[PDB]
Design a protein around this ligand. Sequence first.
Ligand SMILES: [Mg+2]
Ligand SMILES: [Mg+2]
Ligand SMILES: [Mg+2]
Ligand SMILES: [Mg+2]
Ligand SMILES: [Mg+2]
Ligand SMILES: [Mg+2]
Ligand SMILES: [Mg+2]
Ligand SMILES: [Mg+2]
Ligand SMILES: [Mg+2]
Ligand SMILES: [Mg+2]
Ligand SMILES: [Mg+2]
Ligand SMILES: [Mg+2]
Ligand SMILES: [Mg+2]
Ligand SMILES: [Mg+2]
Ligand SMILES: [Mg+2]
Ligand SMILES: [Mg+2]
Ligand SMILES: [Mg+2]
Ligand SMILES: [Mg+2]
Ligand SMILES: [Mg+2]
Ligand SMILES: [Mg+2]
Ligand SMILES: [Mg+2]
Ligand SMILES: [Mg+2]
Ligand SMILES: [Mg+2]
Ligand SMILES: [Mg+2]
Ligand SMILES: [Mg+2]
Ligand SMILES: [Mg+2]
Ligand SMILES: [Mg+2]
Ligand SMILES: [Mg+2]
Ligand SMILES: [Mg+2]
Ligand SMILES: [Mg+2]
Ligand SMILES: [Mg+2]
Ligand SMILES: [Mg+2]
Ligand SMILES: [Mg+2]
Ligand SMILES: [Mg+2]
Ligand SMILES: [Mg+2]
Ligand SMILES: [Mg+2]
Ligand SMILES: [Mg+2]
Ligand SMILES: [Mg+2]
Ligand SMILES: [Mg+2]
Ligand SMILES: [Mg+2]
Ligand SMILES: [Mg+2]
Ligand SMILES: [Mg+2]
Ligand SMILES: [Mg+2]
Ligand SMILES: [Mg+2]
Ligand SMILES: [Mg+2]
Ligand SMILES: [Mg+2]
Ligand SMILES: [Mg+2]
Ligand SMILES: [Mg+2]
Ligand SMILES: [Mg+2]
Ligand SMILES: [Mg+2]
Ligand SMILES: [Mg+2]
Ligand SMILES: [Mg+2]
Ligand SMILES: [Mg+2]
Ligand SMILES: [Mg+2]
Ligand SMILES: [Mg+2]
Ligand SMILES: [Mg+2]
Ligand SMILES: [Mg+2]
Ligand SMILES: [Mg+2]
Ligand SMILES: [Mg+2]
Ligand SMILES: [Mg+2]
Ligand SMILES: [Mg+2]
Ligand SMILES: [Mg+2]
Ligand SMILES: [Mg+2]
Ligand SMILES: [Mg+2]
Ligand SMILES: [Mg+2]
Ligand SMILES: [Mg+2]
Ligand SMILES: [Mg+2]
Ligand SMILES: [Mg+2]
Ligand SMILES: [Mg+2]
Ligand SMILES: [Mg+2]
Ligand SMILES: [Mg+2]
Ligand SMILES: [Mg+2]
Ligand SMILES: [Mg+2]
Ligand SMILES: [Mg+2]
Ligand SMILES: [Mg+2]
Ligand SMILES: [Mg+2]
Ligand SMILES: [Mg+2]
Ligand SMILES: [Mg+2]
Ligand SMILES: [Mg+2]
Ligand SMILES: [Mg+2]
Ligand SMILES: [Mg+2]
Ligand SMILES: [Mg+2]
Ligand SMILES: [Mg+2]
Ligand SMILES: [Mg+2]
Ligand SMILES: [Mg+2]
Ligand SMILES: [Mg+2]
Ligand SMILES: [Mg+2]
Ligand SMILES: [Mg+2]
Ligand SMILES: [Mg+2]
Ligand SMILES: [Mg+2]
Ligand SMILES: [Mg+2]
Ligand SMILES: [Mg+2]
Ligand SMILES: [Mg+2]
Ligand SMILES: [Mg+2]
Ligand SMILES: [Mg+2]
Ligand SMILES: [Mg+2]
Ligand SMILES: [Mg+2]
Ligand SMILES: [Mg+2]
Ligand SMILES: [Mg+2]
Ligand SMILES: [Mg+2]
Ligand SMILES: [Mg+2]
Ligand SMILES: [Mg+2]
Ligand SMILES: [Mg+2]
Ligand SMILES: [Mg+2]
Ligand SMILES: [Mg+2]
Ligand SMILES: [Mg+2]
Ligand SMILES: [Mg+2]
Ligand SMILES: [Mg+2]
Ligand SMILES: [Mg+2]
Ligand SMILES: [Mg+2]
Ligand SMILES: [Mg+2]
Ligand SMILES: [Mg+2]
Ligand SMILES: [Mg+2]
Ligand SMILES: [Mg+2]
Ligand SMILES: [Mg+2]
Ligand SMILES: [Mg+2]
Ligand SMILES: [Mg+2]
Ligand SMILES: [Mg+2]
Ligand SMILES: [Mg+2]
Ligand SMILES: [Mg+2]
Ligand SMILES: [Mg+2]
Ligand SMILES: [Mg+2]
Ligand SMILES: [Mg+2]
Ligand SMILES: [Mg+2]
Ligand SMILES: [Mg+2]
Ligand SMILES: [Mg+2]
Ligand SMILES: [Mg+2]
Ligand SMILES: [Mg+2]
Ligand SMILES: [Mg+2]
Ligand SMILES: [Mg+2]
Ligand SMILES: [Mg+2]
Ligand SMILES: [Mg+2]
Ligand SMILES: [Mg+2]
Ligand SMILES: [Mg+2]
Ligand SMILES: [Mg+2]
Ligand SMILES: [Mg+2]
Ligand SMILES: [Mg+2]
Ligand SMILES: [Mg+2]
Ligand SMILES: [Mg+2]
Ligand SMILES: [Mg+2]
Ligand SMILES: [Mg+2]
Ligand SMILES: [Mg+2]
Ligand SMILES: [Mg+2]
Ligand SMILES: [Mg+2]
Ligand SMILES: [Mg+2]
Ligand SMILES: [Mg+2]
Ligand SMILES: [Mg+2]
Ligand SMILES: [Mg+2]
Ligand SMILES: [Mg+2]
Ligand SMILES: [Mg+2]
Ligand SMILES: [Mg+2]
Ligand SMILES: [Mg+2]
Ligand SMILES: [Mg+2]
Ligand SMILES: [Mg+2]
Ligand SMILES: [Mg+2]
Ligand SMILES: [Mg+2]
Ligand SMILES: [Mg+2]
Ligand SMILES: [Mg+2]
Ligand SMILES: [Mg+2]
Ligand SMILES: [Mg+2]
Ligand SMILES: [Mg+2]
Ligand SMILES: [Mg+2]
Ligand SMILES: [Mg+2]
Ligand SMILES: [Mg+2]
Ligand SMILES: [Mg+2]
Ligand SMILES: [Mg+2]
Ligand SMILES: [Mg+2]
Ligand SMILES: [Mg+2]
Ligand SMILES: [Mg+2]
Ligand SMILES: [Mg+2]
Ligand SMILES: [Mg+2]
Ligand SMILES: [Mg+2]
Ligand SMILES: [Mg+2]
Ligand SMILES: [Mg+2]
Ligand SMILES: [Mg+2]
Ligand SMILES: [Mg+2]
Ligand SMILES: [Mg+2]
Ligand SMILES: [Mg+2]
Ligand SMILES: [Mg+2]
Ligand SMILES: [Mg+2]
Ligand SMILES: [Mg+2]
Ligand SMILES: [Mg+2]
Ligand SMILES: [Mg+2]
Ligand SMILES: [Mg+2]
Ligand SMILES: [Mg+2]
Ligand SMILES: [Mg+2]
Ligand SMILES: [Mg+2]
Ligand SMILES: [Mg+2]
Ligand SMILES: [Mg+2]
Ligand SMILES: [Mg+2]
Ligand SMILES: [Mg+2]
Ligand SMILES: [Mg+2]
Ligand SMILES: [Mg+2]
Ligand SMILES: [Mg+2]
Ligand SMILES: [Mg+2]
Ligand SMILES: [Mg+2]
Ligand SMILES: [Mg+2]
Ligand SMILES: [Mg+2]
Ligand SMILES: [Mg+2]
Ligand SMILES: [Mg+2]
Ligand SMILES: [Mg+2]
Ligand SMILES: [Mg+2]
Ligand SMILES: [Mg+2]
Ligand SMILES: [Mg+2]
Ligand SMILES: [Mg+2]
Ligand SMILES: [Mg+2]
Ligand SMILES: [Mg+2]
Ligand SMILES: [Mg+2]
Ligand SMILES: [Mg+2]
Ligand SMILES: [Mg+2]
Ligand SMILES: [Mg+2]
Ligand SMILES: [Mg+2]
Ligand SMILES: [Mg+2]
Ligand SMILES: [Mg+2]
Ligand SMILES: [Mg+2]
Ligand SMILES: [Mg+2]
Ligand SMILES: [Mg+2]
Ligand SMILES: [Mg+2]
Lengths: 63, 100, 51
Amino acid sequence: PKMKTHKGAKKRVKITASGKVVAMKTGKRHLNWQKSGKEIRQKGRKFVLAKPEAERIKLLLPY
Amino acid sequence: RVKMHVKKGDTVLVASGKYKGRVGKVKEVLPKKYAVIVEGVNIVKKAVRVSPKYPQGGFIEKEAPLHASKVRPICPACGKPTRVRKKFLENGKKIRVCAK
Amino acid sequence: KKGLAMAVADRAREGKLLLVEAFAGVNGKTKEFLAWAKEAGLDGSESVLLV
RNA sequence: UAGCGGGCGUGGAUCCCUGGAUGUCCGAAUGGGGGAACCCGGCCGGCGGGAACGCCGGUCACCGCGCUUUUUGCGCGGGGGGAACCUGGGGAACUGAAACAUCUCAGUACCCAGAGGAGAGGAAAGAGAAAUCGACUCCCUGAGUAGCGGCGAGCGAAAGGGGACCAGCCUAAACCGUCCGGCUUGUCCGGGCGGGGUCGUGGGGCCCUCGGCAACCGAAUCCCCAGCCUAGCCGAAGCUGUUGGGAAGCAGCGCCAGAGAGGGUGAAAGCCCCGUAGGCGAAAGGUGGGGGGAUAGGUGAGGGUACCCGAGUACCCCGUGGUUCGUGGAGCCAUGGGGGAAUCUGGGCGGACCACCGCCUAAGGCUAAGUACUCCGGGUGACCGAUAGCGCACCAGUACCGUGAGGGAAAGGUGAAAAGAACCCCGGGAGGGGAGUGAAAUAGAGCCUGAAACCGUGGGCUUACAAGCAGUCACGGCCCCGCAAGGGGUUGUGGCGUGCCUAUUGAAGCAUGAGCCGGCGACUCACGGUCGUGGGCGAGCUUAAGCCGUUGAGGCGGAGGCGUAGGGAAACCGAG
Ligand SMILES: [Mg+2]
Ligand SMILES: [Mg+2]
Ligand SMILES: [Mg+2]
Ligand SMILES: [Mg+2]
Ligand SMILES: [Mg+2]
Ligand SMILES: [Mg+2]
Ligand SMILES: [Mg+2]
Ligand SMILES: [Mg+2]
Ligand SMILES: [Mg+2]
Ligand SMILES: [Mg+2]
Ligand SMILES: [Mg+2]
Ligand SMILES: [Mg+2]
Ligand SMILES: [Mg+2]
Ligand SMILES: [Mg+2]
Ligand SMILES: [Mg+2]
Ligand SMILES: [Mg+2]
Ligand SMILES: [Mg+2]
Ligand SMILES: [Mg+2]
Ligand SMILES: [Mg+2]
Ligand SMILES: [Mg+2]
Ligand SMILES: [Mg+2]
Ligand SMILES: [Mg+2]
Ligand SMILES: [Mg+2]
Ligand SMILES: [Mg+2]
Ligand SMILES: [Mg+2]
Ligand SMILES: [Mg+2]
Ligand SMILES: [Mg+2]
Ligand SMILES: [Mg+2]
Ligand SMILES: [Mg+2]
Ligand SMILES: [Mg+2]
Ligand SMILES: [Mg+2]
Ligand SMILES: [Mg+2]
Ligand SMILES: [Mg+2]
Ligand SMILES: [Mg+2]
Ligand SMILES: [Mg+2]
Ligand SMILES: [Mg+2]
Ligand SMILES: [Mg+2]
Ligand SMILES: [Mg+2]
Ligand SMILES: [Mg+2]
Ligand SMILES: [Mg+2]
Ligand SMILES: [Mg+2]
Ligand SMILES: [Mg+2]
Ligand SMILES: [Mg+2]
Ligand SMILES: [Mg+2]
Ligand SMILES: [Mg+2]
Ligand SMILES: [Mg+2]
Ligand SMILES: [Mg+2]
Ligand SMILES: [Mg+2]
Ligand SMILES: [Mg+2]
Ligand SMILES: [Mg+2]
Ligand SMILES: [Mg+2]
Ligand SMILES: [Mg+2]
Ligand SMILES: [Mg+2]
Ligand SMILES: [Mg+2]
Ligand SMILES: [Mg+2]
Ligand SMILES: [Mg+2]
Ligand SMILES: [Mg+2]
Ligand SMILES: [Mg+2]
Ligand SMILES: [Mg+2]
Ligand SMILES: [Mg+2]
Ligand SMILES: [Mg+2]
Ligand SMILES: [Mg+2]
Ligand SMILES: [Mg+2]
Ligand SMILES: [Mg+2]
Ligand SMILES: [Mg+2]
Ligand SMILES: [Mg+2]
Ligand SMILES: [Mg+2]
Ligand SMILES: [Mg+2]
Ligand SMILES: [Mg+2]
Ligand SMILES: [Mg+2]
Ligand SMILES: [Mg+2]
Ligand SMILES: [Mg+2]
Ligand SMILES: [Mg+2]
Ligand SMILES: [Mg+2]
Ligand SMILES: [Mg+2]
Ligand SMILES: [Mg+2]
Ligand SMILES: [Mg+2]
Ligand SMILES: [Mg+2]
Ligand SMILES: [Mg+2]
Ligand SMILES: [Mg+2]
Ligand SMILES: [Mg+2]
Ligand SMILES: [Mg+2]
Ligand SMILES: [Mg+2]
Ligand SMILES: [Mg+2]
Ligand SMILES: [Mg+2]
Ligand SMILES: [Mg+2]
Ligand SMILES: [Mg+2]
Ligand SMILES: [Mg+2]
Ligand SMILES: [Mg+2]
Ligand SMILES: [Mg+2]
Ligand SMILES: [Mg+2]
Ligand SMILES: [Mg+2]
Ligand SMILES: [Mg+2]
Ligand SMILES: [Mg+2]
Ligand SMILES: [Mg+2]
Ligand SMILES: [Mg+2]
Ligand SMILES: [Mg+2]
Ligand SMILES: [Mg+2]
Ligand SMILES: [Mg+2]
Ligand SMILES: [Mg+2]
Ligand SMILES: [Mg+2]
Ligand SMILES: [Mg+2]
Ligand SMILES: [Mg+2]
Ligand SMILES: [Mg+2]
Ligand SMILES: [Mg+2]
Ligand SMILES: [Mg+2]
Ligand SMILES: [Mg+2]
Ligand SMILES: [Mg+2]
Ligand SMILES: [Mg+2]
Ligand SMILES: [Mg+2]
Ligand SMILES: [Mg+2]
Ligand SMILES: [Mg+2]
Ligand SMILES: [Mg+2]
Ligand SMILES: [Mg+2]
Ligand SMILES: [Mg+2]
Ligand SMILES: [Mg+2]
Ligand SMILES: [Mg+2]
Ligand SMILES: [Mg+2]
Ligand SMILES: [Mg+2]
Ligand SMILES: [Mg+2]
Ligand SMILES: [Mg+2]
Ligand SMILES: [Mg+2]
Ligand SMILES: [Mg+2]
Ligand SMILES: [Mg+2]
Ligand SMILES: [Mg+2]
Ligand SMILES: [Mg+2]
Ligand SMILES: [Mg+2]
Ligand SMILES: [Mg+2]
Ligand SMILES: [Mg+2]
Ligand SMILES: [Mg+2]
Ligand SMILES: [Mg+2]
Ligand SMILES: [Mg+2]
Ligand SMILES: [Mg+2]
Ligand SMILES: [Mg+2]
Ligand SMILES: [Mg+2]
Ligand SMILES: [Mg+2]
Ligand SMILES: [Mg+2]
Ligand SMILES: [Mg+2]
Ligand SMILES: [Mg+2]
Ligand SMILES: [Mg+2]
Ligand SMILES: [Mg+2]
Ligand SMILES: [Mg+2]
Ligand SMILES: [Mg+2]
Ligand SMILES: [Mg+2]
Ligand SMILES: [Mg+2]
Ligand SMILES: [Mg+2]
Ligand SMILES: [Mg+2]
Ligand SMILES: [Mg+2]
Ligand SMILES: [Mg+2]
Ligand SMILES: [Mg+2]
Ligand SMILES: [Mg+2]
Ligand SMILES: [Mg+2]
Ligand SMILES: [Mg+2]
Ligand SMILES: [Mg+2]
Ligand SMILES: [Mg+2]
Ligand SMILES: [Mg+2]
Ligand SMILES: [Mg+2]
Ligand SMILES: [Mg+2]
Ligand SMILES: [Mg+2]
Ligand SMILES: [Mg+2]
Ligand SMILES: [Mg+2]
Ligand SMILES: [Mg+2]
Ligand SMILES: [Mg+2]
Ligand SMILES: [Mg+2]
Ligand SMILES: [Mg+2]
Ligand SMILES: [Mg+2]
Ligand SMILES: [Mg+2]
Ligand SMILES: [Mg+2]
Ligand SMILES: [Mg+2]
Ligand SMILES: [Mg+2]
Ligand SMILES: [Mg+2]
Ligand SMILES: [Mg+2]
Ligand SMILES: [Mg+2]
Ligand SMILES: [Mg+2]
Ligand SMILES: [Mg+2]
Ligand SMILES: [Mg+2]
Ligand SMILES: [Mg+2]
Ligand SMILES: [Mg+2]
Ligand SMILES: [Mg+2]
Ligand SMILES: [Mg+2]
Ligand SMILES: [Mg+2]
Ligand SMILES: [Mg+2]
Ligand SMILES: [Mg+2]
Ligand SMILES: [Mg+2]
Ligand SMILES: [Mg+2]
Ligand SMILES: [Mg+2]
Ligand SMILES: [Mg+2]
Ligand SMILES: [Mg+2]
Ligand SMILES: [Mg+2]
Ligand SMILES: [Mg+2]
Ligand SMILES: [Mg+2]
Ligand SMILES: [Mg+2]
Ligand SMILES: [Mg+2]
Ligand SMILES: [Mg+2]
Ligand SMILES: [Mg+2]
Ligand SMILES: [Mg+2]
Ligand SMILES: [Mg+2]
Ligand SMILES: [Mg+2]
Ligand SMILES: [Mg+2]
Ligand SMILES: [Mg+2]
Ligand SMILES: [Mg+2]
Ligand SMILES: [Mg+2]
Ligand SMILES: [Mg+2]
Ligand SMILES: [Mg+2]
Ligand SMILES: [Mg+2]
Ligand SMILES: [Mg+2]
Ligand SMILES: [Mg+2]
Ligand SMILES: [Mg+2]
Ligand SMILES: [Mg+2]
Ligand SMILES: [Mg+2]
Ligand SMILES: [Mg+2]
Ligand SMILES: [Mg+2]
Ligand SMILES: [Mg+2]
Ligand SMILES: [Mg+2]
Ligand SMILES: [Mg+2]
Ligand SMILES: [Mg+2]
Ligand SMILES: [Mg+2]
Ligand SMILES: [Mg+2]
């Protein structure tokens, strides 16, 4: 009775204006040590998912 | 209580079925069963003796009570609905045309 | 709203609508109203919604 | 509830409503005992000759409170039950986390105590950002937001806004009078009673100046009334024919309608009966602020003084609970342990802490309404119709089962009317056959309709040299319906032929399930999503609770929600 929004998702995914769904690239908080400078710059951006991306949206909706 | 209904021990007409038209004084009215007894609906009870005692009990064509709604009162004319009218002292039912 | 209009409207196009006023047969009495409807084309042949 | 056998009623019974009377015994059970419904007493009085015995009437439990000169007593109260609802004290686990321990289920189940027609809560030591709101409760919304969370599963507020309802009060303390007790005579020590006082524009006490008040408020307390409740009463309009076992059907003409709701009457009735619409009614009891009256209460302004303003409390620390808050930066509310103030230049709060700016007055209590429930009464169903519907339509919480707690069925139908089959016949009876009733007895009494499995009697076809999922195709014979070209039943021979379901790579399978028949039996609903689809409207669309209206009628209600701007963690900026 009245769906609860999944907070785990809300806390780490943003649903874009057109429908797409973005989030940060994985592995970047401690994996490094000297990993290429190119690595961490590209791990700095965010991206779009696809099929889970559509699974994702369902976990929100009021959101 | 409330059982009160059309007529009592007095003259009445049977608009029933078998004895339609027939007329006679009601000799008995039983409110519990909601039924009256006149002089029609006589029935052959070939039964031997009624009560345990006595010799022959008779096949008496005793009058079978009729549904109280199968009989209608009657007064100086034909059978007519009742219409309760009260005088200056108390109350006495007047028929639709004449009185009582 | 539309429905209420379209109903009244549908009923108006059929020509079975009828505004009145001259209820000479006031004071609650069936036989009287019968007279009024008589002299009004409501012969009781058709179902009437009297608003 | 009929039968035998007796009575009553218009000097108005039965019956219905109100009040009263009597009410053995057990049961909170209350003189005492006790294995509830039984046993045994004290005291006062009565009855029988009545001392011994017995009966009868009255009285005698316990606890709390107030008196009582203490004693002994007197008075008021308590005790137990209640379908669900309510508050409080205690308080699980399965389960979810696809294991599990934090967490979840859940402060749920349940145990206990208590309250009442409700209970709880309730007149800010509040909320929290507006220098704003102004008791409490309940609905909508805010909001699945803020936030909580092995940041897992999952949990999940408040302010504000729209509504229902609407109410506010009493004390403690200073201070004055009185009574009792006390000492070391003081506006003194304690205690009871009365006056005084009651709050955040801080109030009150005590002093000085002015009404030395008529007035004005006014009950939640009383009293009267309306009204409603517990029986009731009046209430319009139809006759002829006709078929029928039976008219209410059919046919002709007619009427009533503030009544054409419904039930009954042998079938289908506005006008036959009870009713319906619309009206009327209480000696008695209950209810009764809706209206009216009364009382209890209650209220002004400066100036002065620093008398009072609820203590093992505030406050801090330790251990915890509550909240959205799981130790988190963790306040706030609550409190088991320890330390331990002040009386308004006093204290608490606005999320560690400090300053500033504000809010509020703790440590005493009471308060109606709006809200919850349904044992009970009424009304209504796109609710069931006897394997359904409450477990129970019926003599059911029964029969029966269990030591017990506890479990717990089945069982409705003659007919309009009993008219329930006299009498005769066979029979010990049962049961039949005549007769008789009825429209019908194939309605005959567990009796409406009476399906299937299952059992049997009669008849047609068929079968004792034949190997079978039982059938199917063909032909032929016998029998039967239309004299007739056709079709039905049956089966002799010949061709062909590995049940049904389930589960499986694969089943006739020696894998699963089914004796057979009948009935019961399984993808629902609520809320929230997503897509499609049928419509309304359109840069707009839509209301929610609720209110007005109805009594199957709708309308009002924009609080709020979605959309018209995105990007960013954010500050912020913006078609970027
Ligand atoms: Mg919802
Ligand atoms: Mg979540
Ligand atoms: Mg990281
Ligand atoms: Mg780090
Ligand atoms: Mg390293
Ligand atoms: Mg590499
Ligand atoms: Mg970088
Ligand atoms: Mg009478
Ligand atoms: Mg006849
Ligand atoms: Mg009138
Ligand atoms: Mg009239
Ligand atoms: Mg009329
Ligand atoms: Mg009797
Ligand atoms: Mg009799
Ligand atoms: Mg007599
Ligand atoms: Mg007399
Ligand atoms: Mg009388
Ligand atoms: Mg009484
Ligand atoms: Mg009585
Ligand atoms: Mg009595
Ligand atoms: Mg007696
Ligand atoms: Mg006892
Ligand atoms: Mg007693
Ligand atoms: Mg005993
Ligand atoms: Mg004695
Ligand atoms: Mg003697
Ligand atoms: Mg004596
Ligand atoms: Mg005695
Ligand atoms: Mg005694
Ligand atoms: Mg005692
Ligand atoms: Mg005690
Ligand atoms: Mg005492
Ligand atoms: Mg005392
Ligand atoms: Mg006293
Ligand atoms: Mg004494
Ligand atoms: Mg003493
Ligand atoms: Mg005493
Ligand atoms: Mg008493
Ligand atoms: Mg009960
Ligand atoms: Mg509780
Ligand atoms: Mg567990
Ligand atoms: Mg769950
Ligand atoms: Mg588990
Ligand atoms: Mg699991
Ligand atoms: Mg396990
Ligand atoms: Mg646990
Ligand atoms: Mg909990
Ligand atoms: Mg609780
Ligand atoms: Mg707890
Ligand atoms: Mg617990
Ligand atoms: Mg107790
Ligand atoms: Mg109780
Ligand atoms: Mg109570
Ligand atoms: Mg009460
Ligand atoms: Mg209350
Ligand atoms: Mg109420
Ligand atoms: Mg209360
Ligand atoms: Mg509450
Ligand atoms: Mg209270
Ligand atoms: Mg600010
Ligand atoms: Mg302002
Ligand atoms: Mg406000
Ligand atoms: Mg205030
Ligand atoms: Mg509230
Ligand atoms: Mg409610
Ligand atoms: Mg509401
Ligand atoms: Mg996190
Ligand atoms: Mg997990
Ligand atoms: Mg919880
Ligand atoms: Mg609000
Ligand atoms: Mg509000
Ligand atoms: Mg309401
Ligand atoms: Mg209301
Ligand atoms: Mg003394
Ligand atoms: Mg002394
Ligand atoms: Mg003292
Ligand atoms: Mg003193
Ligand atoms: Mg003193
Ligand atoms: Mg004193
Ligand atoms: Mg006073
Ligand atoms: Mg004053
Ligand atoms: Mg002063
Ligand atoms: Mg009041
Ligand atoms: Mg009454
Ligand atoms: Mg009544
Ligand atoms: Mg009248
Ligand atoms: Mg009448
Ligand atoms: Mg005539
Ligand atoms: Mg007729
Ligand atoms: Mg006919
Ligand atoms: Mg006719
Ligand atoms: Mg004529
Ligand atoms: Mg009928
Ligand atoms: Mg008809
Ligand atoms: Mg019909
Ligand atoms: Mg017909
Ligand atoms: Mg009728
Ligand atoms: Mg009139
Ligand atoms: Mg009336
Ligand atoms: Mg009436
Ligand atoms: Mg009246
Ligand atoms: Mg009366
Ligand atoms: Mg009265
Ligand atoms: Mg009177
Ligand atoms: Mg009286
Ligand atoms: Mg009285
Ligand atoms: Mg009463
Ligand atoms: Mg009452
Ligand atoms: Mg009362
Ligand atoms: Mg008045
Ligand atoms: Mg007064
Ligand atoms: Mg002053
Ligand atoms: Mg001084
Ligand atoms: Mg102290
Ligand atoms: Mg003190
Ligand atoms: Mg204390
Ligand atoms: Mg410690
Ligand atoms: Mg603490
Ligand atoms: Mg905590
Ligand atoms: Mg933790
Ligand atoms: Mg917790
Ligand atoms: Mg944390
Ligand atoms: Mg810290
Ligand atoms: Mg703080
Ligand atoms: Mg403590
Ligand atoms: Mg201090
Ligand atoms: Mg201050
Ligand atoms: Mg200060
Ligand atoms: Mg505090
Ligand atoms: Mg504090
Ligand atoms: Mg605050
Ligand atoms: Mg700290
Ligand atoms: Mg505050
Ligand atoms: Mg106190
Ligand atoms: Mg209340
Ligand atoms: Mg209330
Ligand atoms: Mg309600
Ligand atoms: Mg009820
Ligand atoms: Mg009821
Ligand atoms: Mg009912
Ligand atoms: Mg039905
Ligand atoms: Mg049955
Ligand atoms: Mg039940
Ligand atoms: Mg049952
Ligand atoms: Mg019953
Ligand atoms: Mg029952
Ligand atoms: Mg019995
Ligand atoms: Mg029973
Ligand atoms: Mg059963
Ligand atoms: Mg009968
Ligand atoms: Mg007969
Ligand atoms: Mg019989
Ligand atoms: Mg016979
Ligand atoms: Mg014979
Ligand atoms: Mg014989
Ligand atoms: Mg024998
Ligand atoms: Mg015989
Ligand atoms: Mg015969
Ligand atoms: Mg038959
Ligand atoms: Mg036959
Ligand atoms: Mg019988
Ligand atoms: Mg029987
Ligand atoms: Mg039988
Ligand atoms: Mg049969
Ligand atoms: Mg049979
Ligand atoms: Mg059969
Ligand atoms: Mg057979
Ligand atoms: Mg046969
Ligand atoms: Mg045969
Ligand atoms: Mg044949
Ligand atoms: Mg051979
Ligand atoms: Mg085969
Ligand atoms: Mg052939
Ligand atoms: Mg042939
Ligand atoms: Mg031949
Ligand atoms: Mg032949
Ligand atoms: Mg053939
Ligand atoms: Mg064959
Ligand atoms: Mg063959
Ligand atoms: Mg074969
Ligand atoms: Mg296998
Ligand atoms: Mg094998
Ligand atoms: Mg086999
Ligand atoms: Mg096997
Ligand atoms: Mg198996
Ligand atoms: Mg098998
Ligand atoms: Mg199977
Ligand atoms: Mg079977
Ligand atoms: Mg088997
Ligand atoms: Mg068997
Ligand atoms: Mg079966
Ligand atoms: Mg069933
Ligand atoms: Mg089904
Ligand atoms: Mg489904
Ligand atoms: Mg829906
Ligand atoms: Mg849906
Ligand atoms: Mg569309
Ligand atoms: Mg369209
Ligand atoms: Mg559209
Ligand atoms: Mg436009
Ligand atoms: Mg809403
Ligand atoms: Mg209103
Ligand atoms: Mg209304
Ligand atoms: Mg209404
Ligand atoms: Mg309505
Ligand atoms: Mg009306
Ligand atoms: Mg209607
Ligand atoms: Mg409505
Ligand atoms: Mg309107
Ligand atoms: Mg608006
Ligand atoms: Mg809007
Ligand atoms: Mg607007
Ligand atoms: Mg407004
Ligand atoms: Mg929403
Ligand atoms: Mg858009
Ligand atoms: Mg953002
Ligand atoms: Mg910028
Ligand atoms: Mg541009």
